[PDB]
Design a binder for this molecule. Structure first.
Ligand SMILES: OC[C@@H](O)[C@@H](O)[C@H](O)[C@H](O)CO
Length: 417
């Protein structure tokens, strides 16, 4: 009777959902589902276009915690009021930092499919061999020291892998969060960019030096999913990235290293911010959809306690989508299955998008800046920083250009207001 076209990202938990929709259609027999599966940079571009232009291409959209409140405030998204009121759905069980990030003027504009922070994943075996112990709360100087000791570029072992692929939510997510730990900020309180200041220089130079010495070849091509593969296939001593990866790297069905993974907090520099981030991937409906009832039903199915149970039954408790529900972290079976759960939740809770930086800022967001202009600005700055990583431009030149383009775009948009 109704068919939903759903735009989503090519991440593992979504690929897994695509295999489980018979459960949805069995429970909702008039409703079928088809997919448009895209890399995250491209998803963002296509969904933004669709939603802004009322393109009608996607009935359900996979969107981030960045987009949800912006688009929600603008009137571009249908409110998920039926979900918010539904007893079995139990929206109160959604983690508060996550639910609150998706809510505007008392209405929920997207439902979280999974959420995450960031942390260090490392190879226990390679640490033991190098004579190293990972502190629970490492510094960046320790990470640098460790990476230098583990690299064995002859045996295709890189001491560290980090995001290098250009994109507002790819390399820029990682670098922005890392910069906070170095005492940087994107903007001062007058919305002047800060790429010409010492803390961004320190961050970017630290990153480029680290990656040139100890990272994989062509890292400027590696996003989240390429790094996940490098880590899983045993090529990476340490990877500092999304907590969602923890289940994937410890699944022996897809990870050679599954029994050798350790976890520690995002690294810092003793400045008072660690820079662990807060992200969620969410499902949303365009305002003015003529398929709201069916779309609501799908979103409720995918983001319910029952969906977690469905995945647990099929693939094991460790492999459910993380970070969305108090009841998941309270579940003894999940805790037994997922040794990374406590640190994941602790990190989701400690992430501080309200106060991301050492110096006060006019924006919110750890790894992004919560303004509508960020997609375009972050994309352009991501291209500069990827070029610096690749040795195509100097670190200093990349920062000069980032400063100039950001000034240009912000003045064009009218800041400060
Ligand atoms: O969930 C893993 C990634 O899709 C996610 O970390 C995104 O890169 C996001 O942009 C991080 O803020």
């Amino acid at each position: 009777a109704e068919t939903l076209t759903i735009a989503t990202v090519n991440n593992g938990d979504m690929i897994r959902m695509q295999k489980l929709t018979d459960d949805f259609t069995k429970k909702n027999p008039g409703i079928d589902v088809k997919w448009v599966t895209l890399e995250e940079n491209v998803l963002r571009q296509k969904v933004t276009t669709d939603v802004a232009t009322k393109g009608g291409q996607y009935d359900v959209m996979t969107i981030g915690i960045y987009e949800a409140p912006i688009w929600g405030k603008q009137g571009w998204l249908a409110p998920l009021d039926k979900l918010s009121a539904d007893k079995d759905y139990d929206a109160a069980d959604l983690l508060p930092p996550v639910r609150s990030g998706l809510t505007v003027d008392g209405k929920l504009y997207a439902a979280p499919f999974y959420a995450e922070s960031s942390m260090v994943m490392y190879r226990k075996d390679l640490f033991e061999k190098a004579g190293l112990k990972m502190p629970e709360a490492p510094t960046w100087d320790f990470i640098k020291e460790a990476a230098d000791k583990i690299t064995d570029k002859s045996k295709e072992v890189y001491g560290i892998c980090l995001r290098g692929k250009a994109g507002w939510g790819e390399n820029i997510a990682f670098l922005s969060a890392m910069s906070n730990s170095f005492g940087a900020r994107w903007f001062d309180e007058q919305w002047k960019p800060q790429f010409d200041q010492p803390e961004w220089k320190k961050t970017l130079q630290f990153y480029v030096d680290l990656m040139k010495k100890n990272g994989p070849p062509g890292a400027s091509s590696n996003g989240f999913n390429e790094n996940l593969a490098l880590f899983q296939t045993g090529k990476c001593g340490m990877w500092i990235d999304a907590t969602v990866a923890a289940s994937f790297v410890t699944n022996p069905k897809e990870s050679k290293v599954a029994d050798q993974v350790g976890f520690a907090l995002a690294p810092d520099n003793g400045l008072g911010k660690r820079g662990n981030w807060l992200w969620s991937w969410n499902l949303a409906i365009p305002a003015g959809s003529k398929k709201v009832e069916a779309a609501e039903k799908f979103i409720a199915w995918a983001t319910s306690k029952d969906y977690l149970k469905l995945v647990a039954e099929k693939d094991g408790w460790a492999n459910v989508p993380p970070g969305t529900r108090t009841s998941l972290y309270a579940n003894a079976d999940y805790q037994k299955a997922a040794p990374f759960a406590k640190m994941t939740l602790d990190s989701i809770n400690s992430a501080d998008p309200k106060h991301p930086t050492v110096k006060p800022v006019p924006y919110e967001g750890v790894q992004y800046v919560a303004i509508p202009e960020f997609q375009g600005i972050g994309t352009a700055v991501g291209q500069q920083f990827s070029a610096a990583l690749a040795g195509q431009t100097t670190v200093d030149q990349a920062l000069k250009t980032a400063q100039t383009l950001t000034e240009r775009e912000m003045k064009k948009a009218g800041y400060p207001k």
